[PDB]
């Protein structure tokens, strides 16, 4: 069974992966907009600068959240795949997993 296991869980990084661009894309344009607006009405360049920064900080937790999700998903791919007796799951969730 291992080739469609392998597929499956394949396609399900896959999703895992358009997700997160989505989501940073959806955050990006809403940035460069926000931004605009900001530019429109009177702003200062350092009070933009916040707002950037700040933005640039939420796409970094998507990009770092949906990457602790291909990790635990790695792990567990890893480790039913080297899955052997005696070997010893300290976790509880990827047991359940």
């Given at each position: 069974?291992?080739?469609?296991?392998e597929?499956e869980?394949?396609?399900?990084?896959?999703?895992?992966e358009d997700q997160?661009?989505?989501?940073?894309?959806?955050?990006?344009?809403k940035?460069e907009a926000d931004l605009?607006?900001?530019?429109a009405?009177?702003?200062?360049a350092?009070?933009?600068?916040?707002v950037?920064d700040?933005?640039e900080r939420?796409?970094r937790?998507?990009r770092?959240?949906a990457?602790?999700?291909?990790d635990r998903?790695?792990?567990?791919?890893?480790?039913?795949?080297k899955?052997?007796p005696?070997?010893?799951i300290?976790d509880?969730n990827?047991?359940?997993?």
């Amino acid at each position: 069974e291992l080739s469609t296991l392998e597929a499956e869980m394949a396609v399900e990084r896959k999703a895992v992966e358009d997700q997160r661009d989505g989501e940073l894309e959806a955050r990006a344009q809403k940035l460069e907009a926000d931004l605009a607006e900001l530019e429109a009405e009177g702003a200062k360049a350092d009070a933009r600068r916040k707002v950037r920064d700040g933005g640039e900080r939420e796409m970094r937790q998507i990009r770092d959240r949906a990457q602790r999700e291909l990790d635990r998903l790695e792990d567990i791919w890893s480790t039913f795949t080297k899955l052997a007796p005696k070997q010893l799951i300290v976790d509880e969730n990827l047991y359940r997993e």
